[PDB]
């Protein structure tokens, strides 16, 4: 459990102090491990952080599997996912370390390579909703990959660039977007 | 205006946090006291750039005959400009790493950003292209959705991005009518 202890501790350090401030020395000593083991498993602070994000994305997917039973039809699932995306981000503790992380390794094509495989996972959630929505005549989309990328990124924008407003208004808007968007697929 | 140019460049190349008071003065070659907050300098640049965009938009919107077309175009152009949108990641940090006199003050910057759509949508209501009772909501949603597509895909074929943005604009408008 040394690999999973290191990630657990590193998660909490990144949460408490951000990405740049947290050193690998800290993570080593606090998880009772060695620079060696940390190097053998993750090679860099950068890659360790990506691995956390993998664990976190998996937990999110696992969360979404349970939570999407409260949505009988894919139209309902679309509405719900976008809400969840907005509401849960408001108190996602890693979010700040993520902002800090991305806005620092976006240029390195390899790190930006793995960060894309990660967003692709977020985009898969919509892809499913839309594919299944087709197979139940909720709508007709011949370009599911496209409309999926659009939804994911439209929704991130509404989640990220609003913040200023109070949480009720932000939920109203998000749901209004969800409405407008699904109406344009008809 | 010796500072502001290098600050922009620095803020765009590296983060809001990563670029510094020292780095700004030393790289621009100017007096430390001369520029005496960082948040004040930042909010200044955002205003400048946001104006340079809305100005460029006015000298370019003429090529769209109907407001339906203005929507598509403004959004398409949002991908190509050198103004404002290249500072979006820097703004994301800004909110996290930042009060009262500033955090409420830069909602006047947001309303300027949203106003572009407010015209387009209000104009379209006069022109009878659609009917939006909740213009202001739709404007805020439009602005942010688009900013999303612009910002969270800045690492892929620019011509693909323009395709996505157009498939977006279509859907959004189709859902208004
Ligand atoms: C657990 C968990 C819990 C949640 N409530 C949650 C909520 C929403 C999404 C994931 C969530 N997860 C899953 C967490 C996984 C996060 C993985 C995202 C890594 C890529 C970063 C996204 N990103 C991209 C793409 C492009 C950018 N320009 C950019 C700029 C600034 C900041 C981010 C940027």
From Swiss-Prot, chain B:
Work out whether the entry's keyword set contains Transcription: yes
What keywords would UniProt list here?
A: DNA-binding, Plasmid, Repressor, Transcription, Transcription regulation
Q: Name one GO molecular function term.
A: DNA binding
Database matches in InterPro entries:
DNA-bd_HTH_TetR-type_CS, Homeodomain-like_sf, HTH-type_Tx_Regulator, HTH_TetR, Tet_transcr_reg_TetR-rel_C_sf, Tscrpt_reg_QacR_C
Biological process (GO) annotations held by this record are: negative regulation of DNA-templated transcription
User: Could you identify this protein by its name?
Assistant: HTH-type transcriptional regulator QacR
The residues covered by the HTH tetR-type domain are 1-53
The free-text function statement in the UniProt record for this protein reads: Transcriptional repressor of qacA. Binds to IR1, an unusually long 28 bp operator, which is located downstream from the qacA promoter and overlaps its transcription start site. QacR is induced from its IR1 site by binding to one of many structurally dissimilar cationic lipophilic compounds, which are also substrates of QacA.
* Quaternary data: Homodimer. Binds cooperatively to DNA as a pair of dimers.
Q: Which domain of life is it from?
A: Bacteria
Q: Which PANTHER family match?
A: ACREF/ENVCD OPERON REPRESSOR-RELATED, ACREF_ENVCD OPERON REPRESSOR-RELATED
Extract the DNA-binding region annotation as residue ranges: 20-36
């Amino acid at each position: 459990n040394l690999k999973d202890k290191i990630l657990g501790v590193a998660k909490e350090l990144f949460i408490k102090n951000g990405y740049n401030a947290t050193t690998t020395g800290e993570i080593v000593k606090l998880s009772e491990s060695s620079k060696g083991n940390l190097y053998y498993h993750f090679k860099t602070k950068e890659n360790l952080f990506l691995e956390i994000l993998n664990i976190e994305e998996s937990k999110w997917q696992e969360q979404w599997k349970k939570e999407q039973i409260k949505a009988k039809t894919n139209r309902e699932k679309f509405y719900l996912y976008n809400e969840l995306s907005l509401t849960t981000e408001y108190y996602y503790p890693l979010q700040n370390a993520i902002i800090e992380f991305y806005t620092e390794y976006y240029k390195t094509n390899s790190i930006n390579e793995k960060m894309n495989k990660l967003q692709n996972k977020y985009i898969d959630a919509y892809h499913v909703i839309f594919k299944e929505g087709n197979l139940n005549g909720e709508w007709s989309i011949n370009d599911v990959n496209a409309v999926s990328k659009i939804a994911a990124n439209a929704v991130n924008g509404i989640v990220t660039f609003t913040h200023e407003q109070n949480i009720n208004e932000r939920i109203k808007l998000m749901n209004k977007f969800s409405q407008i968007f699904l109406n344009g697929l008809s």
